[PDB]
Design a protein around this ligand. Structure first.
Ligand SMILES: O=P(O)(O)OC[C@H]1O[C@H](O)[C@@H](O)[C@@H](O)[C@@H]1O
Ligand SMILES: O=P(O)(O)OC[C@H]1O[C@H](O)[C@@H](O)[C@@H](O)[C@@H]1O
Lengths: 287, 294
């Protein structure tokens, strides 16, 4: 049922925080598929399409939608069928579970010794990369935006001081001021779109614009289940459902960064240029 | 007066008149030092005027205080020529001082007239933090019955922008407040950007509340006009080429680095609206040089 379909999901996220919202949903979809007491290939298919959607309502991050779409895609005689569906699904889950590791290996080599890295907000993938640089005995320092409204940035600084890397938290407003001190920018993303750009915490776009104006490379680190079937041209093309996950106050939770503002993306599919994403997205979705 | 003498006065001057420019607050305090100074020698006076200026900059790091001071002191220090008795100078210095104070009393309005042209109707304007000059430029637009909308950042860490939004709301001007982090996100929705300045430096760049550089750089990438409204007394004798060149004096009012102002290069500025006329950044040096020489 939905209500403890949701509680399973939320519970899977509450007990492991550093678990991606997507992967949490896949396990909730996997477990749902297991407990499904139906008797029709047909009613199973529907109820899964109802479960994925029910999950997308409670947490409307773009990655739980795209990851959900990809996992259900990968799942392609009810007694028989059901079983191997679960085995394909558990194979798919097994693969996206090494994604963070392969990214760490890939990206951390682009960090020169004595580099000072500028990042935005909290990214579990960025932190795994920087952890891998510490593992590789590389010495570096970090600037991170405090990142209103939830102040994820201090969460990242505190995590980063536990590995004894010098980290300084700056105001969101000070990114233009601090850009000259950085040698490169690394950020994560909630979603990677078809044109090679990204959807990430509000403030990413302006960091990328200030980075291009001082010719500082701008690197993105994201798993391939974040590849989403969208092609934005402006900020209004990002669907409002992923944007909120006479005085007034607008407050979007993420903005969009165009491919022209992005140097490379480091992914479990390999190092990519923004223009190259489209060919890799096709291969990813058809497979 | 003495040191806590000036500080108490100066702090009180702005305490009761919030809209009063900080530099003007210093000029009045400095004037009151000339009126209350009972010394009886010329350069001992001047020399101690050069200590009140420095003692004042200690409590308010705004770079306008230093610039406005030096221009007033340099302007009144022309009294010594052809006024030998220390009591003759003093009298005409006070005179020249209140003359000076009266000129800059006209600076905000002279600006709000020069800039009402560039606010076309139906315009969407973006600004940063709270600027009394910006506020008066818009007051003049609404006064001329012109229709326009505003976006403004909240501007950490004091949320000055929520106070700028409060005022424009009282003008029934449609306004919206966004996060400092959303300026890149919101730029496309704006037709032009207008900010104030704490200081206009010798290359036509500005020193202004932290977050101004961000906005300027994002405005250039979308080809949006970036207009600066600033009084002629904010012209400071500094030539910063980057953020490091901004002296620590004015950068902090006092690991987490929290500067209060950044530098915005002339490359990033379309026009400056000052009480000396509408200037391109490149025309600010020669204008500044004249101002400090006459
Ligand atoms: O890299 P992660 O942790 O998966 O999340 C990626 C992104 O999620 C959110 O949008 C924010 O927290 C960003 O800071 C982060 O980059
Ligand atoms: O326009 P004014 O009142 O001179 O303000 C000068 C400046 O003061 C501070 O630096 C900030 O509040 C800025 O927003 C403002 O531009």
């Amino acid at each position: 049922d939905d209500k403890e379909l949701i509680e399973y999901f939320k519970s899977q996220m509450k007990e492991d925080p550093d678990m991606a919202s997507a992967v949490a949903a896949i396990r909730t979809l996997l477990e749902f598929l297991k407990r499904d007491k139906g008797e029709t290939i047909q009613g199973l298919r529907a109820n899964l399409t109802s479960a994925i959607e029910t999950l997308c309502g409670v947490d409307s991050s773009v990655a739980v939608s795209s990851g959900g779409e990809l996992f259900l895609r990968f799942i392609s005689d009810y007694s028989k069928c059901k079983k191997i569906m679960i085995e394909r699904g558990e194979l798919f889950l097994r693969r996206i579970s090494l994604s963070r590791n392969k990214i760490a290996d890939l990206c951390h080599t682009f960090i020169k010794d004595g580099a000072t890295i500028l990042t935005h907000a909290y990214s579990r993938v960025v932190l795994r990369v920087l952890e891998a640089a510490v593992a590789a005995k590389k010495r570096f320092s970090v600037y991170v935006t405090e990142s209103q409204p939830d102040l994820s940035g201090k969460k990242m600084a505190k995590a980063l001081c536990h590995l004894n890397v010098p980290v300084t938290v700056v105001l969101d407003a000070a990114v233009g001021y601090i850009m000259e001190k950085a040698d490169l920018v690394i950020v994560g993303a909630e979603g990677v779109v078809e044109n090679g750009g990204i959807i990430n915490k509000i403030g990413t776009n302006q960091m990328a614009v200030c980075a291009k104006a001082q010719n500082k490379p701008f690197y993105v680190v994201a798993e391939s289940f974040k590849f989403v079937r969208l092609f934005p041209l402006n900020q209004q093309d990002v669907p409002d459902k992923f944007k909120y996950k006479d005085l007034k106050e607008e407050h979007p939770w993420v903005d969009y960064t165009a491919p022209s503002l992005i140097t490379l993306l480091f992914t479990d599919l390999g190092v990519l240029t923004p223009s190259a994403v489209s060919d890799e997205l096709i291969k990813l979705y058809l497979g």
